[PDB]
A and B are shown apart, each in its own frame.
With several copies, the nearest count.
Chain A
């Protein structure tokens, strides 16, 4: 599972990640690049354009909540399946979000970190963060199986 060098690559980047800023960019990019995801957040407001989405207060506020949850995964790396048990019920039983969408949000997070950290986001660092988003994605889909 997790090597010590994977733990250090994830922990080091996370120590420099502003949860509010990167969370906002994460969710905005998801709704903009994959527009069908907008159906799930229809009550957020005006999502008719990229700028409207990017500056929508609810999008910014929710993205912050999403990345705070990624922070909980960073703190409990060895028990991600247990940490995301309640959120698995919400997304599977109550929201009906297809699991492929969890993966697309993971991919987007990786792209945001890459844009924010540049050359410090090495291939090895990417490898570590892509593994994390996938473990988190499978933890959220757990109550479909």
Chain B
């Protein structure tokens, strides 16, 4: 479930972010690894030095997926369909980790755009990130 105002708030967030999305994706990953060190176990061979090409590269990919989810906000499940296979079937990612990355993305938005993230926009973006995590954990069987 996402209301019409929720969809409007998510669109406002990502329009504001614009081309910065990739770099924000990189910061969210960095914050994830540092604050929740158990998440590194999914990336055992990553160069984890601040601003590594791997973190920046993968961060771009994560953010682009979020941009696609936002642009296809009425059909998130269809937009991230193939990515649900990778995370659920292949990588077997513990569902609690998606909550952690979503929170880190909110932190990154808060750091860069404090006036954007009003209480109501916070709520919408929370619902959006949790919907993304739900889609990516949809099919485990």
Contacts and interface: CB of A to CB of B under 8 A. Distances in A.
Contact of A123 (B31, B94, B110, B123): B31
Interface stretch (B34-42, B58-66, B67-75): B34-42
B94 A98 contact: yes
B103 A107 contact: yes
B120 interface: yes
Interface residues of B, number: 31
A28 B106 CA distance: 17
A94 B48 CA distance: 20
Contacts of A4: none
B91 to A, nearest CB: 8
B34 A39 contact: no
Interface stretch (B16-24, B77-85, B111-119): B111-119
Contacts of B117: 111, 115
A111 B123 CA distance: 12
Contacts of A25: 119
A38 interface: yes
A116 B113 CA distance: 10
Contacts of B41: 96
**Chain B contact surface mostly:** helix
B120 A32 contact: yes
Interface in B99-141: 103, 106-107, 110-112, 114, 117-120, 122-123, 126, 140-141
A33 B119 contact: yes
Most buried by A among B111, B114, B140: B111
A1 B110 CA distance: 28
B1 interface: no
A110 B94 contact: no
Interface stretch (A14-22, A72-80, A124-132): A124-132
A145 interface: no
B126 A33 contact: yes
B93 interface: yes
Nearest to B35: A127
Interface of A: 25, 28-29, 32-36, 38-39, 50, 53-54, 96, 98, 100-101, 107, 110-112, 114-119, 121, 123-124, 126-127, 130
27 contacts: A25-B119, A29-B122, A32-B119, A33-B126, A34-B140, A35-B92, A35-B140, A36-B95, A50-B123, A100-B96, A101-B94, A110-B103, A111-B107, A114-B107, A114-B110, A115-B117, A116-B114, A117-B111, A118-B111, A118-B112, A118-B114, A121-B107, A123-B35, A126-B107, A127-B34, A127-B35, A130-B35
